[PDB]
Write a structure and sequence with these properties.
The structure is a homodimer.
Chain A: E1 14-16, H1 21-31, E2 35-37, H2 42-57, E3 73-76, H3 79-82, H4 84-88, H5 94-103, E4 113-123, E5 133-134, E6 153-159, E7 170-173, E8 207-211, E9 215-218, E10 228-237, H6 246-249, H7 252-255, H8 260-265, H9 281-285
Parallel strand pairs in A: 1-2
Antiparallel strand pairs in A: 2-8, 3-4, 4-10, 5-9, 6-8, 6-10, 7-9
Bound molecules: preaustinoid A2 (2 copies), 2-oxoglutaric acid (2 copies) and fe (iii) ion (2 copies).
One 2-oxoglutaric acid binds at residues 69, 121, 123, 130, 135, 170, 216, 218, 230 of chain A.
Pfam families (chain B): PhyH
Subunit structure (chain B): Homodimer.
Binding site for Fe cation (chain B): 131, 133, 215
Chain lengths: 288, 295
């Protein structure tokens, strides 16, 4: 009795941040995405939002009407440089790694994943809805492999300020990771274009774990006041190249304080790729 | 020529002064092609001499195996060889061809370095399993021959490549087979029935080879010949390199590279387009070359 008996049915499962990893993962497989409510302790999600606000204030807003994803949407990636909670607390969630290890790692080969980006995405008010897309369009041949292709990218998309249907929370399309052809989503290339059934709604600290095969896009921010802010944990196979060059921007001072696993996530350490003439790059960097 | 003898596959050969279009047409037809004189014999000889110390301090690994042993493999060529970083990586024919393979309209450089490896096959070294280089990116075979290119290799003879000292065994036209499998008895139906052909080359020659081409280092049946190679391994901008070059190459060497050589090693970004644009391997909307001070 979830929709009125007889209704058309719109599946967007939700789990507590305290459930098992296999539980959350099974929802990921079946739907392509899933919500983790309280993925981040609320003091953290709050101390974090404060910590990056000054960097966010020095980001001018584009009012372009050119269809961009930069039109009235603020984007900021130096989260580890500018936020102690982020680099010390958020990136060390064992749920994150336990799930990454289930999407990506092969047995006896160590961590099969690393970071692509740490973006804070703040959808400004009056911002047009973002073009629909699969995140794996970042790796342009991936769509060519269809839903039998391996996973390349997952996104722990975390709500900073509340995600309403009015302030433009992300429009998901669960199950589009099993459609038989992966196209771009436009009138010329997508046959279902205009008939794609979206499904929007989260509180500060929640997140959703979306596959890279899943169609989505930020909605229109219809409000006058609400700067709707997010923090996306983009994580990729170790064979793929990060969009952010973190091991050259993030200073060595911060890297020495990270875990072995987090140095691996930012490329300050190698995995069984990105080495140094037959040896781990961590030797040459001063990290034993 | 040979006497109704069985005729092997054609490995096409071009001098480094042929047009990049003529060389690329062969690469596209066969998946591989020799470029005679890719490096000058003077340039290669000084490279071989500039790396030789680090090469002698490399111990030969001998094992009780089918292990890919008794092969020295050295990757710090930029740090050890002025000739390599000043001249070899500035081959305009190398970049012409990379562009024709990897670069998209309006995006700039579609490619960068995966590795710069001196590969010295020792006397008696066993032959290498037949493989495609794109098995490094394990999902690539599943796209088959219609797949895009992920990797090409400019595989240079530093010392002569003979059939007896272990010149690479190549399979022209294996990039057009309808199914790409690992070359094992379990998965490959042509296992044991695959005809290869050596890359007979003189020093400074190279062959350009697709990641789709089946190949393997040959057996070095000589007693004296240490068969040296320089592998310039080039991948598309979205793939991760084997070597963390931007972290082990010193900035002093970085600041002295052309801007395309900085891009090759990750000291500089390239622009990818999706209506959207982004600097791949970049710094919060800016080319990484800013934060590093490279203008
Ligand atoms: C250029 C863009 C790309 C190509 C990549 C994309 C990226 C890395 C994609 C997937 C991902 O896993 O993680 C995040 C959430 C960090 C996003 C961040 C935003 C950008 C950098 C991007 C952009 O800023 O465009 C002006 C876009 O908004 C978008 C969706 O159009 C893209 O596909
Ligand atoms: C581990 C190996 C990998 C996975 C990669 C491969 C690599 C990067 C492949 C492609 C390439 O373009 O560059 C070069 C030519 C430099 C080679 C160098 C040698 C190694 C590092 C490798 C190895 O050392 O095996 C003992 C191999 O020989 C082989 C065939 O098993 C592989 O496919
Ligand atoms: O901000 C959002 O709601 C989604 C943005 C997104 O998916 C992207 O930038 O790739
Ligand atoms: O040494 C050779 O000739 C072949 C090397 C090779 O194919 C590899 O290491 O991948
Ligand atoms: Fe997205
Ligand atoms: Fe090879």
């Amino acid at each position: 009795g979830l929709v009125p008996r007889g209704s058309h049915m719109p599946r967007l499962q939700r789990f507590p941040a305290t459930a098992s990893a296999d539980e959350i993962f099974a929802a990921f497989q079946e739907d392509g995405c899933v919500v983790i409510e309280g993925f981040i302790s609320p003091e953290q999600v709050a101390r974090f939002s404060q910590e990056v606000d000054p960097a966010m204030e020095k980001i001018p807003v584009e009012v372009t009407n050119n269809g961009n994803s930069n039109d009235r949407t603020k984007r900021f990636s130096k989260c580890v440089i500018a936020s102690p909670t982020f680099r010390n607390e958020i990136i060390e969630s064992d749920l994150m790694h336990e799930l990454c290890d289930r999407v990506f790692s092969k047995p006896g080969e160590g961590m099969g994943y690393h970071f692509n980006d740490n973006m804070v995405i703040e959808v400004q008010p009056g911002a047009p809805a973002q073009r629909l897309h699969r995140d794996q369009e970042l790796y342009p041949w991936w769509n060519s492999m269809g839903p039998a292709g391996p996973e390349c990218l997952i996104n722990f998309f975390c709500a900073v300020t509340p995600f309403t249907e009015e302030n433009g929370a992300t429009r998901l399309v669960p199950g589009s990771h099993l459609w038989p052809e992966f196209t771009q989503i436009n009138e010329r290339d997508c046959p279902q274009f205009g008939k794609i059934e979206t499904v929007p709604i989260m509180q500060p600290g929640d997140c959703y774990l979306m596959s890279g095969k899943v169609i989505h896009g930020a909605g229109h921010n219809a409000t006058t006041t609400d700067r709707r802010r997010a923090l996306a944990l983009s994580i990729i196979r170790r064979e793929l190249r990060p969009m952010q060059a973190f091991s050259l921007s993030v200073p060595m001072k911060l890297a020495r304080e990270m875990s072995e696993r987090s140095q691996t996530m930012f490329g300050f350490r190698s995995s069984v790729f990105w080495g140094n003439d037959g040896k781990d790059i961590a030797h040459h960097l001063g990290l034993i």
